[PDB]
Design an enzyme around this catalytic site. Structure first.
Site, PDB file in Angstrom:
ATOM      1  CG  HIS A 115      -1.952   1.117   1.168  1.00  0.00           C
ATOM      2  ND1 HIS A 115      -3.124   1.030   0.449  1.00  0.00           N
ATOM      3  CD2 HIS A 115      -1.958   2.336   1.755  1.00  0.00           C
ATOM      4  CE1 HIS A 115      -3.813   2.148   0.599  1.00  0.00           C
ATOM      5  NE2 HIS A 115      -3.128   2.957   1.387  1.00  0.00           N
ATOM      6  CG  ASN A 145      -3.320   5.827   3.863  1.00  0.00           C
ATOM      7  OD1 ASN A 145      -3.954   5.327   2.934  1.00  0.00           O
ATOM      8  ND2 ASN A 145      -2.751   5.095   4.815  1.00  0.00           N
ATOM      9  CB  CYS A 161      -2.417   2.601  -3.053  1.00  0.00           C
ATOM     10  SG  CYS A 161      -1.566   1.062  -3.463  1.00  0.00           S
TER      11      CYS A 161
END
Lengths: 272, 259
Positions: free
Chosen positions: A167, A186, A231
């Site tokens: 991620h 994030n 991501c």
């Protein structure tokens, strides 16, 4: 919408290339004009596909043309441009190295200090003050460079903290304005791991020695990403948007879709 | 001090010129190699003195050499470089226009009894909607810095910093005198416009210290503040430490060529 804001384009030429029409050098255009005009018969629909074709590679070896240097200096980095495959550390490192050419006050983090919690115990660490003063080595193109930088960018993998797997998240240090900010983005909306907090705090104390207003900020208010694949593009787009002066408040209040980030893959990688 | 921090130098070449051995383009440099080597025999020691010498102007008058284009595009503006002569609006306008060439995100104040530049929209400047002339070409470009030098220490500096996360509207007066009413009104109007596209906008008067003790350097002081802010010297340095008139005498050599 927001993809129109930033200064990139779906072209596969390098961002600093002014020609924009053809990415190839005018010598390479001349020597390979035979292959370029029959590129469909070679199974190609781009100049990068032509100069990677095995028949063109053999003709270039005959004539002494360095096609590998053409790909590294005049084209964008190779990567999943038209599929949803996950980004690797090589796709991200070679992309940030190219942005450091165009944004000459941007410090791209090296490959070793890229995706590791061990940055607090690594032998040689980055000093954000030395980054601002122009005393830290960065790698622009394939060359070591020391230059004053008022922006810092890095993409790291949170897989060290327990999770499903790879991620990517972004870290951006903006030292251009009157209030400097250390930013953690994030796309999933999860708080930074403990080690990331310590690093952000350590950089704040360093920057407080040369500036009066330094903020640490966790850009994790919105869960932008609903896919399991983007991501990587999300983290790179945050750095690029901040470089083009898109405020972090946009990533805090307005959602950015996976569709927009999938189209951003065409802004990142060449057709290869 | 701050003079060593900024990116300028006593060279008379233009800032956007990357050549450091010579200001002249490498074509003019070749064809004038005979006159350039006998500099002292012409009474010159600078390149601007050479391409303006009537003997060199007559030689380049034979072939299709335009020495005037080299002088205007490759060198800094003419002005009081080595003396303490007062700066005109021409010296200030030409200097700000040249800095817009190197600083591609810098919007220079357009120069054109009582006048006022209230006709400007700072939001349009930021979004790349205000026309400006850079290197002789009409362009529109997104600028995150705005600079102006106006007359009321009559020359003062106005600088708007729209880089980064918190923006500032600055008024600099090297004599330490507070801005007048009309300037404050303009700064408050610009802050209201910028608060529509940014969260934090600060308005500020840089008048803590009386930097200027002479009667001549209000011009160089104002241009020095804008140049220092362009090179990312915080406004706080002009508040905490004094900049002497001797340093502004040296900054004149960074501003102009000999002419």
């Amino acid at each position: 919408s927001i993809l129109e804001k930033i200064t990139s384009s779906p072209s596969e030429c390098a961002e600093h290339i002014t020609n924009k029409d053809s990415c190839l050098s005018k010598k390479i255009q001349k020597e390979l004009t035979s292959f370029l005009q029959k590129k469909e018969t070679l199974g190609c629909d781009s100049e990068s596909c032509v100069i990677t074709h095995p028949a063109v590679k053999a003709y270039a070896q005959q004539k002494g043309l360095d096609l590998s240097k053409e790909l590294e200096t005049r084209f964008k980095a190779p990567g999943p441009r038209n599929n949803t495959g996950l980004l690797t550390n090589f796709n991200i490192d070679e992309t940030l190295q190219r942005w450091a050419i165009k944004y000459t006050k941007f410090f791209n983090c090296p490959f070793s200090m890229m995706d590791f919690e061990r940055i607090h115990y690594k032998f040689n660490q980055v000093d954000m003050v030395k980054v601002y003063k122009g005393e830290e080595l960065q790698y622009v193109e394939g060359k070591a460079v020391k230059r004053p930088c008022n922006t810092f960018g890095c993409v790291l993998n949170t897989d060290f903290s327990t999770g499903t797997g790879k991620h990517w998240v972004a870290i951006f240090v903006d030292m251009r304005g009157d209030c400097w900010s250390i930013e953690y983005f994030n796309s999933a909306g999860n708080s930074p791991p403990g080690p990331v907090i310590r690093w952000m705090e350590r950089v704040k104390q360093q920057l407080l020695k040369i500036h009066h207003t330094v903020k640490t900020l966790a850009v994790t208010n919105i869960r932008h990403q609903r896919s399991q694949t983007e991501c990587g593009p999300y983290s790179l787009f945050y750095i690029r948007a901040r470089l083009d002066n898109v405020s972090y408040t946009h990533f805090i209040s307005t959602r950015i879709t996976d569709e927009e980030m999938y189209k951003f893959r065409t802004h990142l990688f060449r057709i290869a």
